[PDB]
Amino acid sequence: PGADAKTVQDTVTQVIEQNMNGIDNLMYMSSNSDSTGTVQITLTFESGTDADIAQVQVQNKLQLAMPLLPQEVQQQGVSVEKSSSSFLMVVGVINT
Amino acid sequence: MPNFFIDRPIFAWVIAIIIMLAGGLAILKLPVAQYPTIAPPAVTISASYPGADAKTVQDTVTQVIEQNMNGIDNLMYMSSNSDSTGTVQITLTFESGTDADIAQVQVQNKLQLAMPLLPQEVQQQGVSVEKSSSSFLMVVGVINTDGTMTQEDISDYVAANMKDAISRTSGVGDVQLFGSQYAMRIWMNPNELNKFQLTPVDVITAIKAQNAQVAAGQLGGTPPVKGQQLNASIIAQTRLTSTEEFGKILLKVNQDGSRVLLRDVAKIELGGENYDIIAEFNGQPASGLGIKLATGANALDTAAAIRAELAKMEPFFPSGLKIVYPYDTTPFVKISIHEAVKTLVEAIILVFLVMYLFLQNFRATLIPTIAVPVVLLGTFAVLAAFGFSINTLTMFGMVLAIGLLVDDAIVVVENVERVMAEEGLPPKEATRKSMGQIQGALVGIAMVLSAVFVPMAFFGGSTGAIYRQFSITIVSAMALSVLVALILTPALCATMLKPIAKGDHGEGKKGFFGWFNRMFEKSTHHYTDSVGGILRSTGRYLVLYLIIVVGMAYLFVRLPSSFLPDEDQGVFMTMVQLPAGATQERTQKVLNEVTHYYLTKEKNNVESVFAVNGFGFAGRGQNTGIAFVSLKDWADRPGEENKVEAITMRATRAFSQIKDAMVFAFNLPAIVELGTATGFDFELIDQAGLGHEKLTQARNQLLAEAAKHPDMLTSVRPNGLEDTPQFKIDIDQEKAQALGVSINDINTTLGAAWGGSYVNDFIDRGRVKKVYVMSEAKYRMLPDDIGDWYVRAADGQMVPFSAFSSSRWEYGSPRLERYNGLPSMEILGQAAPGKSTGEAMELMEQLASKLPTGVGYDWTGMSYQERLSGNQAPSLYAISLIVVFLCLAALYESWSIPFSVMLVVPLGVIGALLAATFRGLTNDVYFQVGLLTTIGLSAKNAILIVEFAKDLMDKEGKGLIEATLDAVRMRLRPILMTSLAFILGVMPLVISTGAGSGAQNAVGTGVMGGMVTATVLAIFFVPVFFVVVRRRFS
Amino acid sequence: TDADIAQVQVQNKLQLAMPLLPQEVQQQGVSVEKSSSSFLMVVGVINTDGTMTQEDISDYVAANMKDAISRTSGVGDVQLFGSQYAMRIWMNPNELNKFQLTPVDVITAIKAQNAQVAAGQLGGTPPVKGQQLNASIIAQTRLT
Amino acid sequence: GIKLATGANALDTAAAIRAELAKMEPFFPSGLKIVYPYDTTPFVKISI
Amino acid sequence: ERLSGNQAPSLYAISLIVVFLCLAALYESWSIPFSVMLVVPLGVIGAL
Amino acid sequence: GSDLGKKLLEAARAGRDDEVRILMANGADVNAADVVGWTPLHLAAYWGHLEIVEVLLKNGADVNAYDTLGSTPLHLAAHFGHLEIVEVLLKNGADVNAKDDNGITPLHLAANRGHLEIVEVLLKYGADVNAQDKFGKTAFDISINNGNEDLAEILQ
């Protein structure tokens, strides 16, 4: 919260990414750090890879980095979960 | 099936081609390693509490975590250490076959919930949950030769420039840094602080305010004033980046107007995170990277990948920086694969020379030269389906099966050659008859050999895993071999082998082969006559048999039993141990001596010495250190005198006269986490809240009793440390409240100055790094320096520590151990020469029942497993024996005849024990598996003699002695052909003294020796067994 | 459904909520457990000599038996039928007010005088040259 | 009051509990005794 | 897309050898497989 | 120091009577002290080895030997409730009123740990009951703060 892309990249993105090594069936790792101070690190795995086990391996290796992160980032919370890029649908709501 | 593929040789070729391609694909794509995962899953919880004692760490951290380790599946036991270096290490060991990823997340998830119960300082440092792996692919040492950089300077370079690139390298699973990146070190001065009326508290407060990230907001942020043109992020305060910026931190503005900065009261430099480990390489300052191989990765590929990364890193290295390889397992692995592979090719070449010697036509020499490789390639395809790696265990498991593989090929071809010579049948017609004689026996052998080996895979624990590598590898090759023997070789034999005129035994030929044919035919006559005389006086050979069985049982008990032979790996360790309370400098002076020795008296053998001061396997501290010695190439260390065994002994001797230091050298084990054989791991437990002192008295009492049984127990010692003098300081609450000094300020001031205090982080050249405040060395060395520290009272006056404290010397634990949540003391020991591990353990158990009230015990590590793996051996031996009998009973259609085969077992084992004993070897896994393969081949040989003999009696109505003599006559050649080839095949392994000779010696010696007795005895003893058995049961 | 992964997924989300909870609720220990709603068994503990009270037994079971059962594989949840002992400070408001003190003064004093301190070492690394002494400094410890 | 982990074996877990209690009994204070006022596992052994 | 095209050559190559050896095994000939596998370009040119 | 001096320190601490005996015969320095200034008598007085204490005092061991913080064997014996050693030491000329660097006497420590029997022995040999430490606290002051009624009764 309140940190610029570069400050967040140096303290969170790189710190985490350095600990995202030696994970089974990792094809590539894309990530970005924005002006608001959000960090998304997407690890795409091989086809046939158990996404549940893949999640567990990412969670274990992230929690080594967690203490090396800033304490303000730890208090805001860091989630590890399965993800997809495109939306299935958009459920719109209006007032008549 | 044989008959099917004789008429269809192209089909047989297709199956051979499909097997060859599937295996060829597997061989290049399979992962190469030294050893597979042998040890069960262990998750280690590690935390640092800067400047905390053993009891503080235990009482604030270790206990609080252990109480929260609930709801985790398949936990066997939990053990932890809490030491005065500020570190805790809680190890949780799980059941073999547990998902290590699941076991780690479960342990790590229950810790996260316990985090808020831990101290602020422990939460700030962080508690690491990792999977246990003591196997490094290699260590990459980084040194500096021009004495410009320190070990902290080198370590920061490696962290910032190399480490991440090596972590990102193909096949690299984990990279551990030997040291730490830079830390902003504020070295405080009590004199300067007291002069300006400041405390370590004031210094911390100012760093936290002036070294911080402050959130601002946005220009024209939502919701805005409609008509806003610009939106911009406001950048407020950001973290400091330099020693210059930190020195300018303002602590106090004086009345006159002068400013008190942080540089005025403290020294500021980029130092290390801790100064416990002083690492030096050949005397020079060093750091480096402990690189581990990733799951299912190729160890040779990774090693090559890492070297190519470092190779392109060199250009950007500063002046004097050098890369060095004190440790690399890759050359040793590359040697093992090659020598194993070399044995398989030589073994095939040797059959060619032997096949041509007896059969004397190149077409017969090709049938095995085609069939064996197809099985070897084919085996790799099956290993791949089991998820196995090309490793020392599987590569030697394959070499041990050569005798069984080579035999399947020879037995089939030889028999076709015999039929054509005796009956004058054409090739295709001869094969049908020939295969019809053995096709039932071959299937019977597959079932018997399966029953010998498959049970070996069902052993549990660490050693149960090493057995399973041989089990599957040997079974998989032996299964393919029998399939190939029924499918491919019949087809080749019927299409490739040239016809032979009836009664043409090559006596008509001239030259060498004419002599040989005439020679061997006379020897077969001498042989059959000789068996005739034995079968007249059978009762004599039964007495001579029981002498062998008794000779076997003796050597079996006399022979010492280890797990794996030690190897000259080009490295070994020297452990340095000074007395309790000894300082870093004192330890350093001994390590300097040890290094001088190796580079002076052993300058011909030793390449490098990696002296690590402050690290010990039995517990860290300033008074412990290890020197890791890297030798030159095996080629430049010729003879036994320049080996790791010989050097180790000389070194230990020379360091025996080191004053006030326990210094000894030793070789590394084949497997790191297997310990030794006859070794045990005892845990003394406080089960009734006695305390540390009463548990020490109980341990001392148990140790003293163990020392009065030198005939059963030897080297019964504690694994942990002893109580050391510690400086007890009592803060007077009343005087502190009277003077207006707060306990928080007293406690922070002492802890910050003497212990060090991690404040917050700063970005040094785009890398977030830590800030520590600690007293400059000279103000935190002695008790007199305590009263030099001042705390500011509420009223403003500066109060020395002397005013509100009182000190005394007491004894306390620098390393507090816990087992399964309760206080413990690990005791190591072993069985006295000639005693089994179970004997020693029952005595330790007996002595322990006589200890004080509330003192329990338990077995851990290897001893835990031994207790469990010991209950299994009976069942597996029993099951294995029953199924062999049953498989032989179905083949011969007799409850009694099977005994004649089963009685051959001791004939192969006696020679094995003789060769091992006379070469000065042990009952190790290689020897044990070699026994199983020796028994299998001798049992296989015996099976065909009984089958041939039985079918003569059943089908041609021949007599007992008539059928037996005809049977052994027919099987003499093929038995001798396999043995000749196979004994020559393993002869190089017995005499090999090079790299990895320890393993080769264990395979070759117990096989050659066993093959010699199993060949010579069995040709004379099987006819005796068969005749005596048939005579007993009509 | 894989209960292992359900526990992992549920807890992953709880861990985002954990910081938003009161300090007091975090310090009591939040627990995610994957057990049956019904009791497998009840391990009752009595004193045949009647030497120990309900409270004494309960503390023994909690301090000596409960944790090892909790760490046993297959045990989803262990419910103590009683309570482990705590150091109970039962405050008198009459005597507090007399000395012009409050529960805040009591709480603050327990924290300052019931503390386990990390006080460093004499002759600790990095040390001066010619240092012969290396000893742990023991300041305040937890009251017993 | 012991509850069984999701999908765990009741008999094998109950056996492991009684094994862990057996190691504690030796170090009990004078008078302490284990009683089994409720167990669902004994019925499964008898019914089988 | 890159992956799919890199591995297509190996897919055709192995598929042809499997179809080849399958015919040799079934019809116990080398010439019948060779005769049958020569028609493959006649089909593939039509698809191209 | 010496070779046997270290053996005596390590042996006197462990309570190895038969090793201490051999060392006393061989002439191991009884005045040998480690970094903190603890002689074999300190270590015997601390860990409560009575037999060895007697043996050391016979072999010309300094009964009023003080460490780098000014503590005597009697300080240690009195603090850890080793009644026999206390008596043996007082018998062999141990200074009953020995103050350390903090002004803490063997009576202060005996009182603090509430060793009623030991407090009476020191008092028998003439322990100053009105001896104050660096904070002006007597053995009486400790008993009242500790809330030991029985001990407060002994000091009137």
Ligand SMILES: CCCCCCCCCCCCCCCCCCCC(=O)O[C@H](COC(=O)CCCCCCCCCCCCCC)COP(=O)(O)OCCN
């Ligand atoms: C009378 C005539 C005949 C009668 C009897 C014949 C009996 C045998 C012939 C049948 C052959 C069928 C083979 C089926 C194998 C079943 C097992 C599937 C493999 C499996 O689940 O294991 C994983 C495979 O994953 C992967 O994808 C990794 C690659 C390994 C896949 C297996 C392919 C290799 C060849 C297997 C066929 C063997 C037959 C040759 C004779 C683990 O492997 P991992 O992912 O951990 O990989 C690391 C490798 N170290």
Ligand SMILES: CCCCCCCCCCCCCCCCCCCC(=O)O[C@H](COC(=O)CCCCCCCCCCCCCC)COP(=O)(O)OCCN
């Ligand atoms: C993607 C990776 C790329 C890697 C590439 C992998 C390579 C794939 C290997 C494919 C295997 C092809 C082998 C075919 C061999 C053809 C032999 C020619 C013989 C020939 O034409 O004569 C036949 C008769 O031969 C006879 O009389 C019988 C001859 C039997 C000898 C067979 C020799 C086999 C050698 C195999 C070598 C192994 C290759 C390495 C894997 C014709 O007459 P007909 O019988 O058809 O007609 C019956 C009429 N009445």
Ligand SMILES: CC(=O)O[C@H]1C[C@@]2(C)[C@@H](C[C@@H](O)[C@H]3[C@@]4(C)CC[C@@H](O)[C@@H](C)[C@@H]4CC[C@@]32C)/C1=C(\CCC=C(C)C)C(=O)O
């Ligand atoms: C000539 C000789 O001695 O054997 C060489 C030759 C060798 C057996 C090679 C290993 C392996 O590719 C072999 C196979 C079966 C691999 C699978 C196919 O592609 C075959 C067409 C190929 C033919 C022989 C070859 C190419 C050797 C090795 C292995 C070296 C490996 C390490 C780890 C050092 C060896 O030298 O030991």
Ligand SMILES: CCCCCCCCCCCCO[C@@H]1O[C@H](CO)[C@@H](O[C@H]2O[C@H](CO)[C@@H](O)[C@H](O)[C@H]2O)[C@H](O)[C@H]1O
């Ligand atoms: C007659 C039948 C006998 C059958 C014997 C078949 C068993 C062969 C054993 C497996 C070895 C082949 O497997 C392959 O070896 C090569 C060695 O050049 C390795 O190659 C790797 O290590 C070498 C080591 O010097 C590096 O230089 C190289 O850059 C790297 O790619 C592969 O990582 C390994 O997968």
Ligand SMILES: CCCCCCCCCCCCO[C@@H]1O[C@H](CO)[C@@H](O[C@H]2O[C@H](CO)[C@@H](O)[C@H](O)[C@H]2O)[C@H](O)[C@H]1O
């Ligand atoms: C449940 C799994 C474990 C089972 C145990 C396996 C052990 C048995 C090994 C295989 C036994 C082979 O069994 C053997 O096969 C061959 C071919 O059928 C037969 O051999 C005979 O076949 C026919 C009779 O059918 C005769 O005309 C011919 O003279 C001869 O070749 C034997 O009469 C039979 O006993």
Ligand SMILES: CCCCCCCCCCCCO[C@@H]1O[C@H](CO)[C@@H](O[C@H]2O[C@H](CO)[C@@H](O)[C@H](O)[C@H]2O)[C@H](O)[C@H]1O
């Ligand atoms: C010592 C190292 C050697 C290790 C390997 C040796 C084991 C195998 C030894 C068998 C050698 C053959 O030994 C064989 O013995 C029998 C008697 O038992 C002899 O037979 C002789 O005695 C028997 C009766 O006892 C007579 O019926 C027979 O007419 C006579 O020739 C054979 O003529 C001899 O050739």
Ligand SMILES: CCCCCCCCCC(=O)OC[C@H](CO)OC(=O)CCCCCCCCC
């Ligand atoms: C041919 C008739 C049976 C042969 C013996 C069968 C024994 C197999 C049991 C087994 O699974 O081996 C595992 C075992 C682990 O210790 O491996 C081994 O130790 C190697 C075999 C031991 C030799 C004992 C037999 C010879 C004594 C007369």
Ligand SMILES: CCCCCCCCCC[N+](C)(C)[O-]
């Ligand atoms: C994988 C190769 C398939 C093997 C087929 C063998 C058929 C055997 C026929 C048996 N029979 C007695 C009828 O000849």
Ligand SMILES: CCCCCCCCCCCC
């Ligand atoms: C735990 C992984 C082991 C998988 C075992 C599969 C073995 C099947 C291979 C059969 C081929 C003949």
Ligand SMILES: CCCCCCCCCC
């Ligand atoms: C651990 C159990 C492994 C099962 C044995 C597999 C034997 C088959 C080999 C082909």
Ligand SMILES: CCCCCCCCCC
């Ligand atoms: C005709 C009988 C088929 C032979 C079966 C071989 C299988 C080997 C199993 C280990």
Ligand SMILES: CCCCCCCCCC
């Ligand atoms: C006197 C002993 C006779 C032994 C001759 C047997 C020769 C066997 C050659 C394999």
Ligand SMILES: CCCCCCCCCC
């Ligand atoms: C359990 C092993 C099988 C033994 C059966 C033998 C029966 C023989 C009696 C005729």
Ligand SMILES: CCCCCCCC
């Ligand atoms: C150790 C687990 C192996 C189980 C696989 C069984 C193979 C038939």
Ligand SMILES: CCCCCCCC
């Ligand atoms: C007369 C006995 C001679 C035996 C010779 C055997 C040759 C190996």
Ligand SMILES: CCCCCC
């Ligand atoms: C064929 C033997 C089976 C082994 C099972 C333990």
